[PDB]
Amino acid sequence: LPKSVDWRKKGYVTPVKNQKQCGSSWAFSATGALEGQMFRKTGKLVSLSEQNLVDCSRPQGNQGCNGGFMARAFQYVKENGGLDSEESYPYVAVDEICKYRPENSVAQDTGFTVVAPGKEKALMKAVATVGPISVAMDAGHSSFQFYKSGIYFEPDCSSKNLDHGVLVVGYGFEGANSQNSKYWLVKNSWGPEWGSNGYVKIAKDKNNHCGIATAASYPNV
Amino acid sequence: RLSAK
Ligand SMILES: [Cl-]
């Protein structure tokens, strides 16, 4: 397994998006993993529609702007046989009527792969060999809100009670000792302006910090 | 969750 990975440097990640005031981080995380998988398969990077997901996956268990889950989203992409691009189905940040139009589909998944819960090495492994991995984390902390740079480590973080889905686009370390001060390169959906260009480095191999490895998964394309 | 902002 490599010492560091950064899928953004390989063209698998779209520019940072903003979920605004709507609880769809789970949709952002889902579209991130999908955009990366579709890229690996076709060599084309296409921004996917989170709005598609907000409005149409209530049957799979999602709740549009009030929460949802990444695997439930992959689940919907599969039952539905498709997912529209952002350009054809724009994000408006509010629960609206499902207007999925298959002529505008640009992605597909036949299911998904899960990572054993709490297993950071399984996660590192999925990251290194597949591409960006959708993950859930506990982001209920002011320190996260105000995060600007470096490795984020918050003592009151939970590894069990999560409220936010993000995307692990890679991992690495700080310094020269590959085995220490490691972090997960995480893509957020609070705009380019939050954190470090919209990303956050989160303590790695520090007991499943903030639950990043608790319920990770990626779509099968 | 949503940004505090
Ligand atoms: Cl959310």
Residue numbers in the entry:
A (entry chain AA): 1 to 221
B (entry chain PA): 443 to 447
Copy out sentences from the published article reporting this entry, exactly as the authors wrote them.
Addressing the elusive specificity of cysteine cathepsins, which in contrast to caspases and trypsin-like proteases lack strict specificity determining P1 pocket, calls for innovative approaches. Hence, we set out to determine the crystal structures of cathepsin complexes with representative peptides of cleaved substrates. As a working model, cathepsin V was chosen because of the resolution of diffracting crystals (up to 1.3 Å) and crystal packing with accessible active site cleft. Reactive site mutants C25A and C25S of cathepsin V were used in structural studies.
The pattern III group (binding shifted to the primed side) consisted of structures of eight non-protected peptides that all bound uncleaved into the primed sites. Electron density maps in the region from P1′–P3′ and partly P4′ of molecule A enabled an unambiguous interpretation. In molecule B the electron density maps enabled the unambiguous interpretation of two further residues, P5′ and P6′, of the peptides AVAEKQ and RLSAKP. The first notable exception in the primed site binding was the peptide RLSAKP with deviation at P4′, where the side chain of Ala was placed instead of H-bonding to Q145, and at P6′, where Pro formed electrostatic interactions with its carboxylic terminal to the amino group of K20. On the non-primed side, the MPD molecule occupied the S2 site, and the CL- anion occupied the same position as the carbonyl oxygens of P1 residues in pattern groups I and II. The heterogeneity of the P1′ position in cathepsin V is explained by the specific interaction between the negatively charged D163 residue and the positive charge of the substrate Arg side chain. Their ionic interaction at a distance of 3 Å is visible in the crystal structure of cathepsin V - RLSAKP peptide complex. Arg and Leu of peptide RLSAKP (non-protected), bound at subsites S1′ and S2′ are shown in the bond model in blue (nitrogen), red (oxygen), and cyan (carbon).
